[PDB]
């Protein structure tokens, strides 16, 4: 990237030797504007390099609008049907690993995504995953009976990312109705064991799908197991 000198602005001297400057820079930087103030300043202050940043809100006119941080390659969803066959096992654990990573720090913070899945996951400079925007198929038993939400009904969603990922893209429950995806996974049914997908990590992803919330390992849990499984191979 080069930056044209007019942009910047020269203030004081910092460090001497090249010579270090205190400046400013006014450019026109890309970014991912939603369009529709207590609710809103809560989000600035939850940062992390694993979630799509706010970088501020648009008040003044209508429609108001949300300005958040451009991620170059879009969503995670796509980006693995397009580049199919194209990615390592490692590469695919290395995702989840990213997506969990900023979970675990949403769980900390005591915040509920909702709707956690690769659609909403997005990809950037050097395959950085990040989680954004914070469908019975990631929805957990208790969603869909009781409409309880917690980070525990998030371990399910991302146990159906998980899946997304190793299935490089795949659609879960695809050609099942939503009735029929709701009795099934009652039943005890879970998505298969995708091939690039090792035996252990089926394993997280059925211990992330427990019917019982409290069964379900938290995401600080995961995160632990999933590098683990990075180490070892
Ligand atoms: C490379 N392909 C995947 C297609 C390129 C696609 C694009 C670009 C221009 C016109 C159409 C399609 N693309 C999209 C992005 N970026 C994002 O989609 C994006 N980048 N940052 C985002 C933040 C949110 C967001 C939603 N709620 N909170 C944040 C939602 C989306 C984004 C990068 N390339």
């Given at each position: 990237?080069?930056?044209?000198?007019?942009?910047?602005?020269?203030?004081?001297?910092?460090?001497?030797?090249?010579?270090?400057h205190l400046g400013?820079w006014?450019?026109?930087?890309?970014?991912?504007?939603?369009?529709?103030?207590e609710?809103?300043?809560?989000?600035?202050?939850?940062?992390?390099?694993?979630?799509?940043?706010?970088?501020?809100?648009?008040?003044?006119?209508?429609?108001?609008?949300?300005?958040?941080?451009?991620?170059?390659?879009?969503?995670?969803?796509?980006?693995?049907?397009?580049?199919?066959?194209?990615?390592?096992?490692?590469?695919?654990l290395?995702?989840?690993?990213?997506?969990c990573?900023g979970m675990?720090?949403?769980?900390?913070?005591?915040?509920?995504?909702?709707?956690?899945?690769?659609?909403?996951?997005?990809?950037?400079?050097?395959?950085?995953?990040?989680?954004?925007?914070?469908?019975?198929?990631?929805?957990?038993?208790?969603?869909?009976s009781?409409?309880?939400?917690?980070?525990?009904?998030?371990?399910?969603?991302?146990?159906?990312?998980?899946?997304?990922?190793?299935?490089?893209?795949?659609?879960?429950?695809?050609?099942?109705?939503?009735?029929?995806?709701?009795?099934?996974?009652?039943t005890?049914?879970?998505?298969?064991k995708?091939?690039?997908?090792?035996?252990?990590?089926?394993?997280?992803?059925?211990?992330?799908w427990?019917?019982?919330?409290?069964?379900?390992?938290?995401?600080?849990?995961?995160?632990?197991?999933?590098?683990?499984?990075?180490?070892?191979?």
């Open positions: 990237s080069v930056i044209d000198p007019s942009e910047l602005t020269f203030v004081q001297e910092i460090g001497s030797g090249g010579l270090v400013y006014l450019n026109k930087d890309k970014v991912a504007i939603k369009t529709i103030i609710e809103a300043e809560v989000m600035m202050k939850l940062s992390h390099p694993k979630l799509v940043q706010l970088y501020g809100v648009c008040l003044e006119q209508a429609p108001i609008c949300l300005v958040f941080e451009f991620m170059e390659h879009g969503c995670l969803s796509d980006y693995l049907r397009t580049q199919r066959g194209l990615f390592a096992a490692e590469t695919l290395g995702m989840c690993l990213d997506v990573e675990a720090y949403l769980e900390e913070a005591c915040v509920i995504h909702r709707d956690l899945a690769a659609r909403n996951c997005l990809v950037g400079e050097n395959q950085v995953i990040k989680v954004s925007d914070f469908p019975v198929k990631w929805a957990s038993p208790e969603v869909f009781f409409s309880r939400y917690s980070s525990k009904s998030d371990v399910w969603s991302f146990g159906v990312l998980m899946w997304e990922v190793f299935s490089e893209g795949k659609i879960p429950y695809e050609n099942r109705s939503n009735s029929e995806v709701v009795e099934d996974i009652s005890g049914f879970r998505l298969y995708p091939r690039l997908a090792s035996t252990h990590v089926y394993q997280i992803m059925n211990h992330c427990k019917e019982r919330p409290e069964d379900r390992p938290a995401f600080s849990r995961l995160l632990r197991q999933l590098a683990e499984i990075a180490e070892s191979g």
